[PDB]
Design a protein around this motif. Sequence first.
Motif, PDB file in Angstrom:
ATOM      1  N   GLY A   1      34.640 -27.544 -18.816  1.00 44.42           N
ATOM      2  CA  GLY A   1      35.404 -26.460 -18.704  1.00 44.42           C
ATOM      3  C   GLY A   1      35.983 -26.347 -17.114  1.00 44.42           C
ATOM      4  O   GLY A   1      36.724 -25.647 -16.626  1.00 44.42           O
ATOM      5  N   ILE A   2      35.094 -26.875 -16.241  1.00 44.94           N
ATOM      6  CA  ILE A   2      34.819 -26.410 -14.774  1.00 44.94           C
ATOM      7  C   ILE A   2      35.590 -27.659 -13.848  1.00 44.94           C
ATOM      8  O   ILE A   2      34.949 -28.684 -14.129  1.00 44.94           O
ATOM      9  N   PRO A   3      36.188 -27.349 -12.981  1.00 43.32           N
ATOM     10  CA  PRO A   3      36.519 -28.096 -12.078  1.00 43.32           C
ATOM     11  C   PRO A   3      35.659 -28.765 -11.202  1.00 43.32           C
ATOM     12  O   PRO A   3      34.489 -28.228 -10.826  1.00 43.32           O
ATOM     13  N   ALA A   4      35.852 -30.130 -10.853  1.00 39.69           N
ATOM     14  CA  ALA A   4      34.727 -30.916  -9.888  1.00 39.69           C
ATOM     15  C   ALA A   4      34.673 -30.501  -8.613  1.00 39.69           C
ATOM     16  O   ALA A   4      33.624 -31.024  -7.839  1.00 39.69           O
ATOM     17  N   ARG A   5      35.183 -29.388  -8.206  1.00 38.47           N
ATOM     18  CA  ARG A   5      34.971 -28.882  -6.695  1.00 38.47           C
ATOM     19  C   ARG A   5      33.737 -28.115  -6.697  1.00 38.47           C
ATOM     20  O   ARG A   5      33.154 -27.694  -5.704  1.00 38.47           O
ATOM     21  N   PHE A   6      33.247 -27.859  -7.996  1.00 30.97           N
ATOM     22  CA  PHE A   6      31.947 -26.968  -7.941  1.00 30.97           C
ATOM     23  C   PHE A   6      30.929 -28.223  -8.141  1.00 30.97           C
ATOM     24  O   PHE A   6      31.069 -29.016  -8.711  1.00 30.97           O
ATOM     25  N   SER A   7      30.064 -28.005  -7.385  1.00 32.85           N
ATOM     26  CA  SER A   7      28.691 -28.708  -7.551  1.00 32.85           C
ATOM     27  C   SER A   7      27.305 -28.150  -7.255  1.00 32.85           C
ATOM     28  O   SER A   7      27.511 -27.223  -6.518  1.00 32.85           O
ATOM     29  N   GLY A   8      26.417 -28.803  -7.480  1.00 35.25           N
ATOM     30  CA  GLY A   8      25.025 -28.103  -7.472  1.00 35.25           C
ATOM     31  C   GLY A   8      24.098 -29.164  -7.232  1.00 35.25           C
ATOM     32  O   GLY A   8      24.069 -30.455  -7.560  1.00 35.25           O
ATOM     33  N   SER A   9      22.885 -28.768  -6.445  1.00 28.62           N
ATOM     34  CA  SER A   9      21.763 -29.665  -6.140  1.00 28.62           C
ATOM     35  C   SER A   9      20.521 -28.979  -6.348  1.00 28.62           C
ATOM     36  O   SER A   9      20.495 -27.765  -6.565  1.00 28.62           O
ATOM     37  N   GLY A  10      19.261 -29.554  -5.596  1.00 25.76           N
ATOM     38  CA  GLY A  10      18.022 -28.977  -5.702  1.00 25.76           C
ATOM     39  C   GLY A  10      17.260 -29.140  -7.084  1.00 25.76           C
ATOM     40  O   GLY A  10      17.639 -29.495  -8.173  1.00 25.76           O
ATOM     41  N   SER A  11      15.784 -28.670  -6.957  1.00 25.44           N
ATOM     42  CA  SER A  11      15.096 -28.702  -7.868  1.00 25.44           C
ATOM     43  C   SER A  11      13.849 -27.694  -7.432  1.00 25.44           C
ATOM     44  O   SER A  11      13.741 -27.608  -6.149  1.00 25.44           O
ATOM     45  N   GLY A  12      12.945 -27.591  -8.396  1.00 23.66           N
ATOM     46  CA  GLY A  12      11.671 -26.843  -8.216  1.00 23.66           C
ATOM     47  C   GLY A  12      12.055 -25.684  -7.462  1.00 23.66           C
ATOM     48  O   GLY A  12      12.207 -24.497  -8.397  1.00 23.66           O
ATOM     49  N   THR A  13      11.978 -25.239  -6.408  1.00 24.44           N
ATOM     50  CA  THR A  13      11.995 -23.959  -5.697  1.00 24.44           C
ATOM     51  C   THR A  13      13.426 -23.711  -5.070  1.00 24.44           C
ATOM     52  O   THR A  13      13.436 -22.634  -4.774  1.00 24.44           O
ATOM     53  N   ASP A  14      14.073 -24.717  -4.683  1.00 22.10           N
ATOM     54  CA  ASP A  14      15.278 -24.524  -3.986  1.00 22.10           C
ATOM     55  C   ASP A  14      16.521 -25.166  -4.566  1.00 22.10           C
ATOM     56  O   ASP A  14      16.343 -26.215  -5.016  1.00 22.10           O
ATOM     57  N   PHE A  15      17.589 -24.208  -4.668  1.00 20.25           N
ATOM     58  CA  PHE A  15      18.965 -24.595  -5.469  1.00 20.25           C
ATOM     59  C   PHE A  15      20.088 -24.232  -4.340  1.00 20.25           C
ATOM     60  O   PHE A  15      19.993 -23.302  -3.786  1.00 20.25           O
ATOM     61  N   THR A  16      21.240 -25.119  -4.628  1.00 16.44           N
ATOM     62  CA  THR A  16      22.290 -24.867  -3.850  1.00 16.44           C
ATOM     63  C   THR A  16      23.626 -24.875  -4.697  1.00 16.44           C
ATOM     64  O   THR A  16      23.663 -26.205  -5.094  1.00 16.44           O
ATOM     65  N   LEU A  17      24.441 -23.983  -4.684  1.00 18.44           N
ATOM     66  CA  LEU A  17      25.832 -24.512  -5.351  1.00 18.44           C
ATOM     67  C   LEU A  17      26.572 -24.436  -4.345  1.00 18.44           C
ATOM     68  O   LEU A  17      26.724 -23.762  -3.256  1.00 18.44           O
TER      69      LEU A  17
END
Lengths: 213, 222
Positions: free
Chosen positions: A57-73
């Motif tokens: 449902g979501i456009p590709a201009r949204f993305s995410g990264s990170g693991s464990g303790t830290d995450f970034t949208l």
Amino acid sequence: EIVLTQSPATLSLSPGERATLSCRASKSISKYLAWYQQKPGQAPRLLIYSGSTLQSGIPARFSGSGSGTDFTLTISSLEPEDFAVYYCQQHNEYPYTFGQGTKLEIKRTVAAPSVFIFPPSDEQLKSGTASVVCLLNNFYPREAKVQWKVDNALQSGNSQESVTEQDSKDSTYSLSSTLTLSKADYEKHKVYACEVTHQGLSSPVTKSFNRGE
Amino acid sequence: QVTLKESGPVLVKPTETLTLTCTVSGFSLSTYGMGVGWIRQPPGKALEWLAHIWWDDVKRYNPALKSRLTISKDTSKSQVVLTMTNMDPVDTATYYCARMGSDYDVWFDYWGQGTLVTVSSASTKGPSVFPLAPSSKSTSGGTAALGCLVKDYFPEPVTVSWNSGALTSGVHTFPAVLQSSGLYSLSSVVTVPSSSLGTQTYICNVNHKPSNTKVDKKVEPK
């Protein structure tokens, strides 16, 4: 239990920019973090799950990264529709928890509010209250000062303001200012004026009316 | 396709018991992997997970509130139920039901639209609806502003629409403020072309579910 700490609390950026939102987990959650977008009086819309899978449902201009303790949208080509509160949520471990959110404003060119005034209806007066309403329509930025004048005299503690959430199409705000007197006091005075000071206005604008008329 | 809808807005007295129904369609509450959860949101505050239930009847509850919660399902009725006892003013929030998006991981892919539960001992009271008539002092060249002031009701929410939903552009409905009498007040306003003020009828439709009151008011230059 697992505490989620979102950063920054608020953010304001122009169409075309990248928003960068952090979420910190107090303990490792591996990849199992989801992100949601929530417009005003609407349910949250799920953007990403498991840290980086872009959802149905979501456009590709949204993305995410990170693991464990830290995450970034990341949100890449800010459009006016991107206005929202954004929540992270761990889906790793009972009990399931949410961050407190980041509120994103979308910048637009300065716009001065069209201002209109409304005397009380005769119908409300018949029940012993008067509501004088000043409307500031479609302005940016959100800061605006409204001042009420009854017969050239300043008012205090008798007005209330309400602001709409930022529009999703044209990024403007609107504002209502409401002066509430008794009927007795209303008819006691002649000229009702709402004085609006806003950055899109070279000088403070006034709207007014003569009682009755 | 897939939808969910929470039972209507309720007013609950301190210490009493809340009961919410989520009605589901587009999938079966007993198909492998299907699950439904409840999440709430106090005004201006963060999202909070309450409970969820899976196809096989497995139940999970927020441990902080576990003592107050029950969740159940009935597949033939297509309904999930949430029961929360000993309600407190602090439990005043928007309550959502949602489906999980996986058969294991607890995150949510489809959401009901939410229901505002207000915990208060005060009585319901429907709104008075006053015109904010268009005039020269609301006609700033070619465009005129008019509205309805929706006043003296409790609890939230109130839904306001224009000409039964046929007028949506230019419509601002402001957040309610809670007045000194312990009742809410708001304005809904709309801007329209001036030339049409002698032609087109403008009506505001004000729906207040908790008190079962509906008011229609025409707005007219005067």
